[PDB]
Amino acid sequence: SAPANAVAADNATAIALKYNQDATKSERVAAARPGLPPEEQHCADCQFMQADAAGATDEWKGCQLFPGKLINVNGWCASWTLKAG
Numbered sequence: 001s002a003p004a005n006a007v008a009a010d011n012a013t014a015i016a017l018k019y020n021q022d023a024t025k026s027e028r029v030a031a032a033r034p035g036l037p038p039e040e041q042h043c044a045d046c047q048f049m050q051a052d053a054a055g056a057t058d059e060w061k062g063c064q065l066f067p068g069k070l071i072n073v074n075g076w077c078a079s080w081t082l083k084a085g
């Protein structure tokens with residue numbers, strides 16, 4: 001079951017960010033962002049990802065651009081940025 005504080009596909013911010021719970025279904029390939037091949041981009045290795053957010057699970061983390069909510073560790077958004085930190 002997905003947390004109640006999970007980002008909905010129909011969420012304004014989600015639509016603006018072009019975020020999708022399942023990265024294999026995102027347009028990450030067409031976006032082609034620097035860092036690594038799109039085929040390998042997902043929330044899991046994103047700079048903005050935070051296993052800080054409360055209620056975070058193994059499949060669900062917090063996201064700096066999504067305060068108060070949780071994203072799918074296997075999701076993706078047009079804002080992806082290779083994790084260094």
Ligand code: SF4
Binds near residue numbers: 042046063075080081
């Ligand atoms: S910015 Fe990163 S962690 Fe947040 S939703 Fe987009 S890809 Fe996932």
